[PDB]
Each structure stands twice: as structure tokens, then as C-alpha cells.
Write a protein that binds this ligand. Structure first.
Ligand code: 19Y
Length: 366
């Protein structure tokens, strides 16, 4: 509806607006986000990161490979177009685009494999400096995008990549993609890692809580969907040592301010505690349970993968997609019920505990 294309001068002259200027970690994030799009779209399964001793970063993936076709209107390869311009848009007047990286880099290189050609192009301070050419050939099914870049010292407090932060980030990302394998190679500290979580979130709560949780084997929703689309979640009840694990994600973007997906998980848990209480007549007469009680001592991680993530206001901190709320709800209800119906011992230990919670709340009302 409103598409906006500009040059890179805005970014160059307000870096703090388009990246965190402490170090290049964010620049790397932006490129991982792009690989991650291909992983979410189902075309990619690898993201490989090398940190070189010259302080450049290289991020590679086995995705479809950045487009190379000449834009009928802009007269320029897809890849050049994305690289040498800010793209933005909306309905009326991060996800800032890789051209931010290009801009704040002294040198950036891209190597693409599509259609059995290997393409190459170099840029400097965000301007093309060597034409897109075919430098090799490759099997038709050998595809991907590979970018290496030399952040430009003048923009950053420090050019040194904060290593620990990146590794944490990469671990966080793999956990949320059982289909993804992330290799990482720091040539400066001579160290390599590989993350592959075939298992998924399974174990994470066990590990991060290491207290007695209920259920003892926290509840897994493994890759539930319908094409509306994808729910992974893990949850259990526990108690304090301030061990708040309450994490939520859309398309791997942290939602520190919750929304439709979180709401959805709150409802469906309630929904199926109500339904289970009634089914077995586990009521007590002046203890009407509420949605908040079933949630009070809940520890969880919910990660949602959806086609059109609409957010709240200016930043991508809260998910506002009306209708994930009932997509997350229906699943958690049915899914949890089945477990409840099969788990007398723990299902009733859970209800009794939520009753204590509601009971204690009702008391505090004078
Ligand atoms: C390694 C990082 C990366 N990996 C990428 N893979 C694709 S594949 C694709 C994307 C959109 C349309 N057609 C193909 N496209 C991209 O740019 C749009 C990137 C990309 C951009 O930085």
C-alpha cells in the first residue's frame, strides 16, 4: 500500500536508530534473521557462522539463495536492490533489512547459489564495487546465500563481537527449531560449536528450574499446527525461588510484552482445568477458580510460528494477531485434557494446588 525505497545515508548518519552501536552483534542478528526467514519458510536447515581474525563475520545458509533477477522497474539485480537500499512500507503513514549491514560495513561480500550458478558481488560503504558475476557452477540442488562483512570501525564503540552473547542467541534460536542445525566457528579463540535440538524445548524447564515441578515431566506441545500455523510450547507448575521462566516468541522474535499467543495459553489452560474439575466434580463451594489462578504458578515457554505477524504500536514486543488467541486456546485445551484424563495422580495434585491459589486469593479479599 505504501512502499518506500531510499539510499543508505539515513542509516550512516543515524546508526543508533538502525542498529546497536556497542558492537556488531546486532548486525549479525539482522543477517541471522534473514537466514531464519528461510528456515521458517521451510527452505533452510543450516545456519553456519564464522568469526574471522580480521573481525569480519560470515553467516551462511542452505536456503533458496537471494534473488538475482533484474528488477523490471529498478534495473538492477534483486540482490543489489536489497543490498544498496533501505526498504520500508506499511498500510498508512527489528526488520530493518540487510542493507543496514552493508551500510555500516567497510566491505561486504555475498555469495549466492541458485540455478546451479555460484554468483558473487562485492560492496563497500554500501556501494557496489564489483559487478554481480557467475564465478562457478554447482548442482541445481546445491542452493544458499553466504554473506561476509567487515563492520566499519567508525560506527561502533567496539568492533569486537561480544562472543558470549552471540552463542547464547544462537542456542536460543536452535532450541526453537528442531529442524535447524547451527554451526559456529570463532577463529579468534579457536573454538567451534554445533547446536541441534532434535528434541526441541524438551528438558529446558527441567534444566532451568531444577526444583520440583508439576507435572514432574513438564508438559510438551511438539510442533502442533493446522497451517494457521505452528505451535510449540512447554509448561509446568512450580514455586518461586524467583525462577520466573515465562518466555514467549513469534517467529522467533521475543515478545517481552506477551499478547494473543500468551493470552491463548492462559485461556486454554483455564478452559481445561474448568472442564476437568467439572468432569470429576472436583469443585469446592466458596472457591470459584479463575483464569489467573491456573496461571499463577505456571512456568512456560511458548513459541508460535505464523504467517502474518501483526504487532502492537511501534515495537515488535507484543503479538496482536487476533485469532492466534483461539488457535493457541483450542490446542492447549484438547492437548492438556487428554493428558489430564490419563494422569489421575498428577491431574488432581494440580487442581488441588490451583484451589489453594484461588483460596488464598479469596481470603485476601476483606
Ligand atoms: C545469510 C543471510 C540471508 N539469507 C538469505 N536467503 C534468502 S532466500 C530468498 C528470500 C526471499 C525470496 N527469495 C529467496 N534471501 C535473503 O534475502 C532476501 C537472504 C539473506 C539476507 O541477508
Amino acid at each position: 500500500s505504501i512502499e518506500v525505497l531510499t539510499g543508505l545515508d539515513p542509516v550512516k548518519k543515524r546508526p543508533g536508530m538502525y542498529t546497536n552501536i556497542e558492537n556488531p552483534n546486532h548486525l549479525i542478528q539482522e543477517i541471522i534473521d534473514n537466514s531464519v526467514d528461510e528456515v521458517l519458510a521451510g527452505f533452510a536447515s543450516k545456519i553456519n557462522i564464522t568469526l574471522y581474525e580480521d573481525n569480519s563475520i560470515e553467516v551462511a545458509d542452505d536456503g533458496r539463495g537471494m534473488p538475482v533477477d533484474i528488477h523490471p522497474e529498478h534495473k538492477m539485480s534483486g540482490i543489489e536492490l536489497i543490498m544498496t537500499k533501505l526498504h520500508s512500507g506499511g498500510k498508512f503513514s527489528h526488520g530493518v533489512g540487510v542493507s543496514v549491514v552493508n551500510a555500516l560495513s567497510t566491505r561486504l561480500e555475498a555469495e549466492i547459489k541458485r540455478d546451479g550458478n555460484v554468483y558473487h558481488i562485492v560492496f563497500e560503504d554500501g556501494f557496489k564495487t564489483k559487478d554481480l558475476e557467475i564465478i562457478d557452477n554447482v548442482g541445481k540442488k546445491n542452493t544458499g546465500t553466504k554473506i561476509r562483512f567487515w563492520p566499519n570501525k567508525k560506527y561502533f564503540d567496539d568492533i569486537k563481537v561480544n562472543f558470549k552473547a552471540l552463542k547464547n542467541l544462537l542456542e536460543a534460536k536452535a532450541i526453537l527449531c528442531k529442524a535447524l542445525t547451527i554451526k559456529y566457528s570463532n577463529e579468534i579463540k579457536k573454538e567451534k560449536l554445533t547446536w541441534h535440538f532434535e528434541t526441541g524445548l524438551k528438558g529446558y524447564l527441567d534444566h532451568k528450574l531444577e526444583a520440583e515441578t508439576l507435572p514432574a515431566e513438564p508438559f510438551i506441545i511438539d510442533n502442533f499446527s493446522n497451517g494457521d500455523s505452528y505451535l510449540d510450547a512447554v509448561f509446568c507448575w512450580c514455586e518461586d525461588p524467583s525462577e520466573s521462566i515465562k518466555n514467549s516468541y513469534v517467529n522467533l522474535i521475543p515478545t517481552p510484552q506477551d499478547g494473543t499467543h500468551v493470552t491463548g495459553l492462559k485461556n486454554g489452560i483455564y478452559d481445561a482445568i474448568k472442564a476437568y474439575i467439572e468432569k470429576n466434580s472436583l469443585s469446592v463451594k466458596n472457591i470459584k477458580i479463575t483464569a489467573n489462578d491456573s496461571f499463577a504458578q505456571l512456568n512456560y515457554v511458548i513459541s508460535v510460528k505464523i504467517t502474518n505477524p501483526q504487532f502492537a504500536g511501534q515495537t515488535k514486543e507484543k503479538l496482536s494477531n487476533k485469532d492466534v488467541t483461539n488457535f493457541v486456546a483450542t490446542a492447549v485445551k484438547d492437548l492438556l485434557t487428554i493428558w489430564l484424563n490419563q494422569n489421575p495422580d498428577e491431574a488432581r495434585q494440580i487442581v488441588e494446588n490451583i484451589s489453594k491459589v484461588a483460596q488464598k486469593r479469596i481470603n485476601a479479599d476483606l
